[PDB]
Coordinates of C-alpha atoms and ligand atoms in Angstrom, one line a residue:
Chain A
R1 CA -32.1 -18.2 19.8
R2 CA -29.6 -17.1 22.4
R3 CA -29.7 -20.6 23.7
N4 CA -29.5 -22.5 20.4
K5 CA -26.4 -20.8 19.4
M6 CA -25.1 -20.9 22.9
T7 CA -25.2 -24.5 22.3
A8 CA -23.5 -24.1 18.9
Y9 CA -20.7 -22.3 20.7
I10 CA -20.4 -25.0 23.3
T11 CA -20.7 -27.8 20.7
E12 CA -17.8 -27.1 18.4
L13 CA -16.0 -25.8 21.4
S14 CA -16.3 -29.3 22.6
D15 CA -15.1 -30.7 19.4
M16 CA -11.7 -29.0 19.0
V17 CA -10.6 -30.3 22.4
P18 CA -8.9 -33.5 21.2
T19 CA -8.8 -35.4 24.5
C20 CA -12.4 -34.3 24.9
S21 CA -13.8 -34.8 21.4
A22 CA -12.4 -38.3 21.7
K23 CA -21.8 -28.0 30.5
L24 CA -19.7 -27.4 33.6
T25 CA -17.3 -30.3 32.6
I26 CA -16.8 -29.3 28.9
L27 CA -15.9 -26.0 30.4
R28 CA -13.4 -26.9 33.1
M29 CA -11.9 -29.5 30.6
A30 CA -11.3 -26.7 28.2
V31 CA -9.7 -24.7 31.1
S32 CA -7.2 -27.3 32.2
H33 CA -6.5 -27.6 28.5
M34 CA -5.5 -24.0 28.4
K35 CA -3.3 -24.7 31.4
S36 CA -1.5 -27.3 29.5
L37 CA -0.6 -24.7 27.0
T38 CA 0.8 -15.8 21.1
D39 CA 4.7 -15.5 21.0
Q40 CA 7.3 -17.1 18.7
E41 CA 4.3 -18.1 16.5
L42 CA 3.5 -14.4 16.3
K43 CA 6.7 -14.0 14.4
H44 CA 5.6 -16.5 11.8
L45 CA 2.3 -14.6 11.7
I46 CA 4.0 -11.5 10.6
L47 CA 6.1 -13.4 8.1
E48 CA 2.9 -14.7 6.7
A49 CA 0.8 -11.6 6.6
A50 CA 3.1 -8.7 6.2
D51 CA 6.0 -10.8 5.1
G52 CA 8.1 -8.9 7.7
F53 CA 10.8 -9.5 10.2
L54 CA 11.9 -7.7 13.4
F55 CA 15.2 -6.1 14.3
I56 CA 16.7 -3.8 16.8
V57 CA 19.7 -1.5 16.3
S58 CA 21.7 0.9 18.4
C59 CA 20.7 4.5 17.5
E60 CA 24.3 5.8 17.6
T61 CA 26.3 3.0 15.9
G62 CA 23.5 1.7 13.8
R63 CA 24.7 -1.6 15.0
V64 CA 22.3 -4.5 14.8
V65 CA 21.8 -5.4 18.4
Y66 CA 19.2 -8.0 17.2
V67 CA 17.9 -9.5 14.0
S68 CA 15.2 -12.2 13.9
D69 CA 15.9 -15.3 11.9
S70 CA 12.9 -14.4 9.7
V71 CA 15.4 -12.0 8.0
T72 CA 16.4 -15.1 6.0
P73 CA 13.1 -16.0 4.4
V74 CA 12.5 -12.3 4.0
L75 CA 15.9 -11.2 2.6
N76 CA 17.6 -14.4 1.6
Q77 CA 20.2 -13.3 4.2
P78 CA 21.8 -15.3 7.2
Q79 CA 21.4 -13.8 10.7
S80 CA 25.2 -13.7 10.9
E81 CA 25.5 -11.3 8.0
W82 CA 23.2 -9.2 10.1
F83 CA 24.1 -9.3 13.8
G84 CA 27.8 -8.8 13.3
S85 CA 26.6 -5.8 11.3
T86 CA 25.8 -2.2 11.2
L87 CA 22.6 -1.5 9.3
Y88 CA 24.1 1.2 7.2
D89 CA 25.8 -1.8 5.5
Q90 CA 22.6 -3.7 4.8
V91 CA 20.9 -0.9 2.8
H92 CA 21.4 0.9 -0.4
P93 CA 24.2 3.4 -0.1
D94 CA 22.0 6.3 -1.4
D95 CA 19.7 5.5 1.4
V96 CA 22.2 6.4 4.1
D97 CA 21.5 10.1 5.1
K98 CA 17.8 9.5 5.3
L99 CA 18.7 6.9 7.9
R100 CA 20.9 9.2 9.8
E101 CA 17.8 11.3 10.2
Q102 CA 15.7 8.4 11.2
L103 CA 18.4 7.7 13.8
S104 CA 9.4 8.8 19.9
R105 CA 8.3 6.6 17.0
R106 CA 9.8 5.8 13.6
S107 CA 8.8 4.7 10.0
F108 CA 10.3 4.8 6.5
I109 CA 10.9 3.0 3.3
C110 CA 14.4 1.7 2.1
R111 CA 16.4 -0.5 -0.3
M112 CA 18.0 -3.3 1.6
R113 CA 20.3 -6.1 0.2
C114 CA 19.9 -9.8 -0.3
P115 CA 24.6 -5.9 -5.8
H116 CA 20.8 -6.4 -5.6
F117 CA 18.4 -4.4 -3.5
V118 CA 14.7 -4.6 -2.3
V119 CA 12.2 -2.1 -1.1
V120 CA 11.4 -2.3 2.6
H121 CA 8.8 -0.5 4.8
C122 CA 10.1 -0.2 8.3
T123 CA 8.0 0.6 11.3
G124 CA 9.1 0.9 14.9
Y125 CA 10.1 3.2 17.8
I126 CA 12.9 4.2 20.0
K127 CA 13.7 2.5 23.3
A128 CA 16.6 2.5 25.6
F129 CA 19.1 4.3 22.7
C130 CA 18.0 1.7 20.2
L131 CA 15.4 1.2 17.6
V132 CA 12.8 -1.5 17.6
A133 CA 11.4 -2.1 14.2
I134 CA 10.0 -4.4 11.7
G135 CA 11.0 -4.6 8.0
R136 CA 8.2 -5.4 5.5
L137 CA 8.0 -6.1 1.8
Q138 CA 5.1 -4.6 -0.2
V139 CA 4.4 -5.2 -3.9
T140 CA 10.3 -4.4 -31.0
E141 CA 8.3 -1.2 -30.3
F142 CA 8.1 1.8 -28.0
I143 CA 5.6 3.9 -26.0
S144 CA 4.6 7.5 -26.5
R145 CA 2.1 10.0 -25.1
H146 CA 0.5 13.0 -27.0
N147 CA -1.7 16.0 -26.6
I148 CA -4.9 16.0 -28.6
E149 CA -3.1 18.0 -31.3
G150 CA -0.7 15.2 -32.1
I151 CA 2.4 16.7 -30.5
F152 CA 4.9 14.4 -28.8
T153 CA 4.7 15.2 -25.1
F154 CA 6.3 12.0 -23.8
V155 CA 8.5 9.3 -25.4
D156 CA 10.1 6.1 -24.2
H157 CA 14.0 5.9 -24.3
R158 CA 13.9 2.9 -26.5
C159 CA 12.7 5.3 -29.2
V160 CA 16.3 5.7 -30.0
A161 CA 16.5 1.9 -30.7
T162 CA 13.3 1.8 -32.7
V163 CA 13.5 4.9 -34.9
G164 CA 17.0 6.2 -34.4
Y165 CA 15.8 9.4 -33.0
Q166 CA 16.8 10.8 -29.6
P167 CA 13.7 11.7 -27.5
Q168 CA 14.6 15.4 -27.7
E169 CA 14.0 15.2 -31.4
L170 CA 10.5 13.7 -31.2
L171 CA 9.3 15.7 -28.3
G172 CA 7.5 18.9 -29.2
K173 CA 6.6 17.8 -32.7
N174 CA 3.4 16.7 -34.1
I175 CA 3.4 13.1 -34.9
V176 CA 1.9 13.8 -38.4
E177 CA 5.0 15.6 -39.4
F178 CA 7.0 12.3 -39.2
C179 CA 4.2 10.6 -41.3
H180 CA 4.4 9.9 -45.0
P181 CA 2.3 12.5 -46.7
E182 CA 0.0 9.9 -48.2
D183 CA -0.8 8.4 -44.9
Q184 CA -1.2 11.6 -43.1
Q185 CA -5.0 12.0 -43.3
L186 CA -5.1 8.4 -42.4
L187 CA -3.2 9.3 -39.2
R188 CA -5.3 12.4 -38.5
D189 CA -8.7 10.9 -38.9
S190 CA -7.4 8.1 -36.8
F191 CA -6.7 10.7 -34.1
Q192 CA -10.1 12.4 -34.3
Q193 CA -11.8 9.0 -33.9
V194 CA -9.5 8.2 -31.0
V195 CA -10.9 11.3 -29.2
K196 CA -14.5 10.8 -30.4
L197 CA -14.1 7.3 -29.2
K198 CA -13.1 8.0 -25.6
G199 CA -10.8 5.6 -23.9
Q200 CA -11.2 2.8 -26.5
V201 CA -8.3 1.6 -28.7
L202 CA -7.8 2.1 -32.3
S203 CA -5.0 0.7 -34.4
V204 CA -3.5 2.2 -37.5
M205 CA -0.5 1.6 -39.8
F206 CA 1.9 4.0 -41.6
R207 CA 5.4 4.8 -42.9
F208 CA 7.4 6.6 -40.3
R209 CA 10.3 8.9 -41.2
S210 CA 13.4 7.2 -39.6
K211 CA 16.3 9.4 -38.4
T212 CA 18.0 7.8 -41.3
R213 CA 15.1 9.3 -43.3
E214 CA 13.5 6.0 -44.0
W215 CA 9.8 5.1 -44.3
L216 CA 9.3 2.6 -41.5
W217 CA 6.0 0.8 -41.6
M218 CA 4.5 1.0 -38.2
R219 CA 1.4 0.0 -36.5
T220 CA 0.4 2.0 -33.4
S221 CA -2.5 1.2 -31.1
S222 CA -3.9 3.9 -28.8
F223 CA -6.6 5.4 -26.7
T224 CA -7.6 8.6 -25.1
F225 CA -7.0 8.9 -21.4
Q226 CA -9.8 10.2 -19.1
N227 CA -9.2 11.7 -15.7
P228 CA -10.6 9.4 -13.0
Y229 CA -12.4 12.2 -11.2
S230 CA -13.5 14.5 -14.0
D231 CA -13.4 12.0 -16.9
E232 CA -12.0 14.6 -19.2
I233 CA -9.3 13.4 -21.5
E234 CA -5.9 15.1 -21.6
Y235 CA -3.6 12.8 -23.4
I236 CA -3.5 9.9 -25.8
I237 CA -1.2 7.0 -25.2
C238 CA 0.4 5.2 -28.1
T239 CA 2.3 2.0 -28.4
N240 CA 4.1 2.2 -31.7
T241 CA 5.3 -1.1 -33.0
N242 CA 7.7 -1.9 -35.8
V243 CA 6.2 -4.0 -38.5
Chain B
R1 CA -26.6 -23.3 41.0
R2 CA -27.0 -20.6 38.4
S3 CA -24.8 -18.7 40.8
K4 CA -21.7 -20.8 40.3
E5 CA -22.0 -21.6 36.6
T6 CA -22.0 -17.9 36.3
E7 CA -18.9 -17.6 38.5
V8 CA -17.2 -20.5 36.5
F9 CA -17.3 -18.0 33.6
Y10 CA -14.8 -15.9 35.7
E11 CA -12.0 -18.5 35.9
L12 CA -12.6 -19.2 32.2
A13 CA -12.4 -15.5 31.3
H14 CA -9.3 -14.9 33.4
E15 CA -7.2 -17.6 31.9
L16 CA -7.7 -16.4 28.3
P17 CA -4.5 -14.7 27.0
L18 CA -6.1 -11.4 28.4
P19 CA -5.5 -9.4 31.5
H20 CA -8.1 -9.6 34.2
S21 CA -8.7 -6.0 33.5
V22 CA -10.1 -7.2 30.2
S23 CA -11.0 -10.8 31.1
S24 CA -13.0 -10.1 34.3
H25 CA -15.3 -7.7 32.6
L26 CA -17.5 -10.0 30.5
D27 CA -21.0 -11.1 29.8
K28 CA -20.7 -14.7 28.8
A29 CA -21.6 -14.5 25.2
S30 CA -18.6 -12.5 24.7
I31 CA -16.5 -15.2 26.5
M32 CA -17.9 -17.8 24.1
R33 CA -17.1 -15.9 21.0
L34 CA -13.7 -15.3 22.4
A35 CA -12.8 -18.8 23.7
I36 CA -13.7 -20.3 20.4
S37 CA -12.0 -17.7 18.2
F38 CA -8.9 -18.2 20.3
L39 CA -9.0 -22.0 19.7
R40 CA -9.5 -21.8 16.0
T41 CA -6.8 -19.2 16.1
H42 CA -4.3 -21.6 17.7
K43 CA -5.4 -24.3 15.2
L44 CA -4.6 -22.5 11.9
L45 CA -1.3 -21.3 13.6
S46 CA -0.4 -24.9 13.9
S47 CA -1.4 -25.1 10.2
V48 CA 1.2 -22.5 9.5
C49 CA 4.4 -23.3 11.4
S50 CA 4.4 -26.8 9.9
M51 CA 8.3 -10.5 26.2
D52 CA 6.5 -10.0 22.8
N53 CA 5.8 -6.4 23.5
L54 CA 8.1 -5.3 20.7
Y55 CA 6.3 -6.8 17.8
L56 CA 3.1 -5.2 19.0
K57 CA 4.6 -1.7 19.6
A58 CA 6.8 -1.8 16.5
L59 CA 3.7 -2.3 14.4
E60 CA 1.8 0.5 12.6
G61 CA -1.4 -1.3 11.9
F62 CA -3.0 -4.5 13.3
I63 CA -3.5 -8.1 12.2
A64 CA -6.8 -9.7 11.4
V65 CA -7.9 -13.1 10.6
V66 CA -11.2 -13.6 8.9
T67 CA -13.1 -16.7 7.7
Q68 CA -14.3 -16.8 4.2
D69 CA -17.8 -16.4 5.8
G70 CA -16.5 -13.0 7.1
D71 CA -16.0 -14.0 10.7
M72 CA -13.3 -12.0 12.3
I73 CA -11.8 -14.9 14.1
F74 CA -8.7 -13.1 15.1
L75 CA -7.8 -9.5 16.0
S76 CA -4.7 -7.8 17.4
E77 CA -4.9 -6.1 20.8
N78 CA -3.4 -2.9 19.5
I79 CA -6.3 -2.6 17.1
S80 CA -7.8 -0.4 19.8
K81 CA -4.8 1.9 19.4
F82 CA -5.9 2.5 15.8
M83 CA -9.5 1.8 15.7
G84 CA -10.5 2.5 19.2
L85 CA -12.7 -0.6 19.0
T86 CA -11.1 -3.1 21.3
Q87 CA -10.3 -6.6 20.1
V88 CA -12.7 -8.0 22.7
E89 CA -15.6 -6.0 21.1
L90 CA -15.2 -7.6 17.7
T91 CA -13.8 -11.1 17.5
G92 CA -16.2 -13.7 16.1
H93 CA -18.4 -11.1 14.5
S94 CA -18.8 -10.5 10.7
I95 CA -16.5 -8.1 9.0
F96 CA -19.3 -6.5 7.1
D97 CA -21.0 -5.2 10.2
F98 CA -18.0 -3.0 10.8
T99 CA -16.9 -2.1 7.3
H100 CA -18.3 0.4 5.1
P101 CA -20.8 -1.6 3.0
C102 CA -20.0 -0.2 -0.5
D103 CA -16.5 -1.5 0.1
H104 CA -17.9 -4.9 1.0
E105 CA -18.0 -6.5 -2.5
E106 CA -14.3 -5.8 -2.7
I107 CA -14.0 -7.4 0.7
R108 CA -16.0 -10.4 -0.5
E109 CA -13.7 -10.9 -3.4
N110 CA -10.5 -10.6 -1.5
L111 CA -11.9 -13.2 0.9
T112 CA -12.2 -15.8 -1.8
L113 CA -10.3 -18.1 -4.2
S114 CA -2.4 -16.0 -6.7
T115 CA -3.3 -16.2 -3.0
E116 CA -1.9 -12.6 -2.6
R117 CA -4.1 -9.7 -1.4
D118 CA -3.7 -5.9 -1.2
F119 CA -6.5 -3.4 -1.0
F120 CA -8.0 -0.6 1.1
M121 CA -11.1 -0.7 3.3
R122 CA -13.1 1.8 5.3
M123 CA -13.7 0.6 8.9
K124 CA -15.4 2.0 11.9
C125 CA -13.3 4.2 14.1
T126 CA -14.1 5.8 17.4
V127 CA -11.0 7.7 18.5
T128 CA -12.3 8.8 21.8
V129 CA -16.1 8.3 21.5
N130 CA -18.9 5.7 21.2
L131 CA -19.8 3.7 18.2
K132 CA -23.0 5.5 17.3
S133 CA -20.8 8.4 16.6
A134 CA -18.2 6.2 14.8
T135 CA -16.6 7.7 11.8
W136 CA -15.0 5.7 9.0
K137 CA -11.2 5.0 8.8
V138 CA -9.2 3.7 5.8
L139 CA -7.0 0.6 6.3
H140 CA -4.4 -0.5 3.8
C141 CA -4.7 -4.2 4.0
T142 CA -2.0 -6.5 2.9
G143 CA -1.9 -10.2 3.4
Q144 CA -2.5 -13.8 2.3
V145 CA -5.5 -16.1 1.8
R146 CA -5.1 -19.6 3.1
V147 CA -6.7 -22.9 4.2
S148 CA -10.8 -20.5 3.2
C149 CA -9.3 -17.9 5.5
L150 CA -7.9 -14.5 5.1
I151 CA -4.9 -13.2 7.1
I152 CA -3.9 -9.6 6.9
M153 CA -2.3 -6.5 8.2
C154 CA -4.2 -3.3 8.3
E155 CA -2.1 -0.2 8.3
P156 CA -3.9 3.1 8.7
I157 CA -2.3 5.5 6.3
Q158 CA -2.0 8.6 8.7
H159 CA -3.3 12.0 8.2
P160 CA -0.8 14.7 7.2
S161 CA -2.2 17.4 9.6
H162 CA -1.8 15.0 12.6
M163 CA 1.7 13.6 12.4
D164 CA 2.8 10.8 14.7
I165 CA 6.2 10.3 13.1
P166 CA 9.2 12.3 12.1
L167 CA 10.1 13.1 8.5
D168 CA 13.6 13.0 6.9
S169 CA 15.3 15.2 4.2
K170 CA 14.3 12.7 1.5
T171 CA 10.6 13.3 2.1
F172 CA 8.7 16.2 0.7
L173 CA 5.1 17.4 0.8
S174 CA 2.6 18.5 -1.8
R175 CA -0.9 19.8 -2.1
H176 CA -3.1 19.1 -5.1
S177 CA -6.5 20.0 -6.6
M178 CA -8.9 17.2 -7.2
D179 CA -7.6 17.3 -10.7
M180 CA -4.3 16.2 -9.2
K181 CA -3.0 19.6 -10.3
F182 CA -0.4 21.0 -8.0
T183 CA -1.5 23.8 -5.8
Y184 CA 1.3 23.4 -3.5
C185 CA 4.7 21.9 -3.0
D186 CA 7.4 22.2 -0.4
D187 CA 10.8 23.1 -1.8
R188 CA 12.4 20.0 -0.7
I189 CA 10.9 19.3 -4.1
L190 CA 13.9 21.2 -5.4
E191 CA 16.5 19.7 -3.2
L192 CA 15.1 16.3 -4.2
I193 CA 14.3 16.3 -7.9
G194 CA 15.0 19.7 -9.1
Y195 CA 11.7 21.3 -9.9
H196 CA 11.0 24.7 -8.3
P197 CA 7.4 24.7 -7.0
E198 CA 6.5 28.0 -8.8
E199 CA 7.1 26.1 -12.0
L200 CA 4.8 23.1 -11.2
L201 CA 1.8 25.1 -9.7
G202 CA -0.4 25.0 -12.8
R203 CA 0.3 21.4 -13.6
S204 CA -1.5 18.0 -13.4
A205 CA 0.6 15.4 -11.7
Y206 CA 0.0 13.1 -14.6
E207 CA 2.6 14.9 -16.7
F208 CA 5.4 13.7 -14.5
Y209 CA 4.8 9.9 -14.4
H210 CA 6.8 7.5 -16.2
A211 CA 4.1 5.7 -18.3
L212 CA 4.5 2.2 -17.1
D213 CA 3.3 3.6 -13.8
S214 CA 0.2 5.4 -15.1
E215 CA -2.2 2.5 -14.9
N216 CA -1.0 1.3 -11.5
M217 CA -1.6 4.9 -10.3
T218 CA -5.0 5.5 -11.9
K219 CA -6.7 2.9 -9.6
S220 CA -4.9 4.7 -6.7
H221 CA -6.4 8.1 -7.7
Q222 CA -9.8 6.3 -7.9
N223 CA -9.3 4.7 -4.5
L224 CA -8.1 8.0 -3.2
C225 CA -11.5 9.4 -4.1
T226 CA -13.9 6.7 -3.2
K227 CA -12.2 6.1 0.2
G228 CA -10.5 9.4 0.8
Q229 CA -7.0 8.0 1.3
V230 CA -4.3 5.9 -0.5
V231 CA -0.8 4.6 -0.5
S232 CA 0.6 4.5 -4.0
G233 CA 2.5 1.6 -5.4
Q234 CA 6.0 2.6 -6.1
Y235 CA 6.3 4.7 -9.3
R236 CA 8.7 6.8 -11.3
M237 CA 8.4 10.6 -11.4
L238 CA 10.3 12.5 -14.1
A239 CA 13.1 14.7 -12.6
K240 CA 13.5 18.2 -14.0
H241 CA 16.6 17.2 -15.8
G242 CA 16.5 13.8 -17.5
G243 CA 15.9 10.6 -15.7
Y244 CA 13.5 10.0 -12.9
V245 CA 13.3 9.2 -9.2
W246 CA 11.3 6.4 -7.6
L247 CA 8.4 7.4 -5.3
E248 CA 5.6 6.4 -3.0
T249 CA 2.9 8.8 -1.8
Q250 CA 0.3 8.9 0.9
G251 CA -2.7 10.7 -0.6
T252 CA -5.2 12.1 1.8
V253 CA -8.3 14.2 1.0
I254 CA -8.8 17.2 3.3
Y255 CA -12.2 18.7 3.9
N256 CA -13.4 22.1 4.6
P257 CA -14.4 21.9 8.3
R258 CA -17.1 24.5 8.2
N259 CA -18.1 23.4 4.7
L260 CA -17.6 19.6 4.8
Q261 CA -16.7 20.0 1.2
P262 CA -13.5 18.6 0.0
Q263 CA -10.7 21.0 -0.6
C264 CA -7.6 19.2 -1.8
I265 CA -5.3 16.2 -1.6
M266 CA -2.4 16.3 0.8
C267 CA 0.5 14.2 -0.4
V268 CA 3.1 12.8 1.8
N269 CA 5.8 12.0 -0.8
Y270 CA 8.6 9.5 -0.1
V271 CA 11.6 9.7 -2.4
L272 CA 13.1 6.3 -2.7
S273 CA 16.0 7.0 -5.0
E274 CA 18.4 9.3 -6.7
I275 CA 17.8 10.2 -10.3
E276 CA 18.4 7.1 -12.2
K277 CA 18.6 8.0 -15.9
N278 CA 20.2 11.4 -15.9
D279 CA 21.3 10.2 -19.3
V280 CA 17.7 9.8 -20.6
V281 CA 15.4 12.7 -21.4
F282 CA 11.8 11.5 -21.4
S283 CA 9.4 14.4 -21.6
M284 CA 9.3 17.9 -23.1
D285 CA 9.8 19.6 -19.8
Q286 CA 13.3 18.2 -19.2
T287 CA 14.4 19.4 -22.7
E288 CA 14.7 23.2 -22.1
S289 CA 18.2 24.5 -22.9
Ligands
0X3_1 O1 -0.3 15.1 -6.9 N1 -0.9 14.2 -6.1 O2 -1.8 14.5 -5.4 C1 -0.3 12.8 -6.0 C2 1.0 12.7 -5.7 N2 1.9 13.8 -5.5 C3 2.8 14.1 -6.5 C4 3.9 14.9 -6.2 C5 4.9 15.3 -7.1 F1 5.9 16.0 -6.8 C6 4.8 14.8 -8.4 C7 3.7 14.0 -8.8 CL1 3.5 13.4 -10.4 C8 2.7 13.6 -7.8 C9 1.6 11.3 -5.7 C10 0.7 10.2 -5.9 C11 -0.6 10.4 -6.1 N3 -1.7 9.6 -6.4 O3 -2.8 10.3 -6.6 N4 -2.5 11.6 -6.5 C12 -1.2 11.7 -6.2

């Protein structure tokens, strides 16, 4: 079957040669065809796969000795912004000292600008001193998190907007203390079943004591959270929505 | 007459975009595989755009193009740098033959049918040795599916023991039990987010995530364990005072050499930001005093 697929090879080999498709001969025709013809294209290849662009900068001045045009599709940034530039300018200011350190082989992540910044993995090496590298792009209610007991261990900031309380006031306390007494066993047995029913979601409703001491009807929907390795559950995650 | 057709191979082999060091040395079947894969290559390139030592070197991973039928039609040279397996050894052949089979279904899915793709695969590595003795190596693969054809970059994650690259002040290092509980942390941790490692020793990492991140991360932990390595999506970790700092981590499972039992995760942690919401206190740990 070596032969049959040898001939498969040679067959469609034949057919992509246009001035041919229109043994020894198929072969030398392909050859001359190569002669008629992995570089600037390679650029677009990166732009496609990694969504990256290449650039070179002086190590000392951090001055962009080169920036590929692909900077534009990648950053929505003209080359001119960039070759007249020093790279310290094109990144987030809190990213600077990192870079000093990065300025053997190199790699790091950083916020570059397009005041709007984007995350960029950069991979390269030092050559004379400059740095050759590529820059790449990789990518109503509030949420709480509790221990089994019911204590607030985590709270979203927007808690302040939804219940009037500052996080500090929720955190540490059992959720059932902010519950209307009537609805409390409702809340509790809700919790038990949440643990009994591992990972699955239960919804429940209840009046919540607002910082203005007000009974705020609220549905929350929640589930226990298993460890991916051990499958043991450490916390419950609630989304607590004003009704 | 056999004599020459055979020798005609040689001119053909030579004038592929390969050095004669790697062109000359070929049984013909290889030359077939290769010629064709090169052509197809050039073809879809034309379908896209409608002295280059630096791109190759600047890279930390390699590019692969694969049919939907799994045929690894294109492979970077520098793949050998990472995989040992040299691009000539592989082009034309089916991906599955070189990938860890359990990870193949995933492979199969990402090959097919948002055209965006990002996943990790275990692939044969021989760095150097022969293929019988070829151990598995995880590749973070990131790229685009096109017309069906998959184009990607495969970045090995690196192993924390065996550094190839320098770290900066805004990078710290941590060790964790399988539970993700801290067992170790460098004290750049302090410099960087405020926690003193003695404090965080007994603690699962999960306590420090901002929630929106959790899910994105869970898969990562899972992938960390099924494959043995990961790069996290970017995520927020709660600083010791209020607010948090953005982060990306390279998780890597280390084994007991005499034991071949796993021991812990080694995390290369990259701090991407300063504390953002000093103003906001999120978790009970930031609340002391
Ligand atoms: O503890 N881990 O092994 C681990 C990471 N390290 C880490 C370091 C910290 F200082 C804080 C946190 Cl939450 C996690 C970061 C991302 C991870 N993904 O899976 N485990 C991870």
